[PDB]
Ligand SMILES: O=C(O)c1cc(C(=O)O)c2c(n1)C(=O)C(=O)c1cc(C(=O)O)[nH]c1-2
Ligand SMILES: [Cl-]
Ligand SMILES: [Zn+2]
Ligand SMILES: [Zn+2]
Ligand SMILES: [Zn+2]
Ligand SMILES: [Zn+2]
């Protein structure tokens with residue numbers, strides 16, 4: 387019944403023009419993570435009840451209920467993709483990919499799936515074995531698939547999911563365990579043909595090669611773009627970020643003093659060709675697995691950064707003070723530093739630290755980052771007391787935007803990392819080749835944190851804290867609410883004006899996935915993916931007083947009583 391009248395998904399849908407739907411990971415191309423739906427608000431959220439839920443596949447459950455005209459399209463782990471009736475929770479269809487033995491995959495991160503994408507009459511995803519796959523939206527049956535190469539034993543995969551722009555399926559990659567770097571590809575949405583492929587590691591003698599400290603090309607590992615892809619329709623620019631290089635220690639990399647051009651860089655590209663329009667490196671010389679690959683939002687804001695605002699690193703030399711600009715803005719890296727650029731040109735406006743961090747010594751008025759020499763891993767076996775951690779700070783769990791108050795709302799972890807490079811020689815399988823102990827940041831007794839930052843001034847308007855890590859995306863809504871899960875297993879709503887908790891329910895496991903909102907027949911639903919991820923096992927032991935069990939992977943859907 388729900389799938390019967392399926393109407394093709396357009397750019398207008400993906401631009402978030404219909405608030406009854408959530409047809410893309412962050413609700414719109416621009417990455418807002420916002421639902422304009424306002425039925426559920428501060429005055430009635432206390433009445434929210436569980437309407438329906440459904441078991442999801444085991445593993446790291448970081449997915450998102452992609453909602454479209456009464457149907458939920460849901461990427462589970464293990465390349466299981468489902469369509470579910472958004473009103474009843476009844477399964478409509480299920481695709482289950484035939485997988486080689488899990489042991490054959492050197493990159494287990496490809497098993498988790500933050501999103502599927504929609505366009506036309508198809509559901510698009512990247513499989514664990516690194517195929518761009520198109521399913522029929524109406525049936526879940528495979529329409530086409532294209533092998534990108536180097537999957538499985540060779541470890542190239544994807545965890546965040548693609549987006550489709552102008553008939554082009556755009557998808558990044560993780561090559562976390564590989565002795566090489568990876569890429570972002572653009573694939574024709576109809577034919578399945580690969581149209582372009584952007585890589586990051588400079589080839590010998592090419593632009594930026596001289597910033598790799600003389601490291602042989604074949605020793606340059608793991609540079610990818612595994613985070614979330616965003617897009618601005620008006621500028622026609624696709625935005626993504628690349629990551630660092632492994633192992634973490636530049637001494638073990640053989641890249642001493644190397645700023646590593648291509649790594650941790652924010653790219654703005656044309657969707658049909660991958661042509662780079664502008665780029666900015668937000669974390670050079672990375673020794674801290676900083677991964678500047680997370681979603682960056684496109685918003686229109688007045689530009690008036692306060693140089694005295696807490697954490698403000700610098701203000702751009704040519705900042706158009708008092709003027710309204712379309713900006714690319716947010717926290718791109720685990721470090722927790724918020725950035726703001728002109729979205730069209732890439733001109734640097736400002737940057738501001740959130741959590742305690744000590745990897746960045748300074749950022750000048752052009753946006754040039756200078757790293758902290760004290761934190762470069764120069765002596766293997768020596769403990770370096772890095773802030774934040776290889777899980778942040780921030781990590782993949784996405785921020786949300788509140789257009790009414792111009793607030794950027796970001797989930798964060800108050801953690802630091804006593805990190806040491808191993809004394810043994812690094813192989814690709816060793817990843818960062820470090821051993822670490824995670825601790826609370828100095829003077830912090832609350833691990834979980836959400837900052838709400840005014841995008842005009844860079845001032846933090848409020849900060850919500852809780853004992854255990856959140857490590858879960860936020861949803862912002864027109865009802866003036868912020869929804870967020872945590873490893874404490876609470877799925878909570880915060881007052882968007884104050885950051886104070888106004889409602890919560892406790893789910894059976896750590897609330898580990900995305901929260902989305904949609905409506906059917908005038909009724910607003912709030913859907914959260916839960917069960918657990920790397921967050922609980924990593925942050926849980928720091929606050930053992932909190933019951934942060936993982937389990938009962940599932941989608942859980944709430945609404946006001948009828
Ligand atoms: O370098 C990479 O290719 C890559 C990929 C992934 C992934 O795809 O999930 C993570 C990381 N790195 C990473 O460093 C880490 O912070 C991390 C946490 C998570 C998670 O699911 O909670 N994924 C990843
Ligand atoms: Cl529609
Ligand atoms: Zn539509
Ligand atoms: Zn990584
Ligand atoms: Zn725009
Ligand atoms: Zn720049």
Ligand SMILES: [Zn+2]
Pocket residue numbers: 416684685686
């Ligand atoms: Zn816009």
Ligand SMILES: [Zn+2]
Pocket residue numbers: 692695843845
């Ligand atoms: Zn101020």
Ligand SMILES: [Zn+2]
Pocket residue numbers: 876878887889890891
């Ligand atoms: Zn509560």
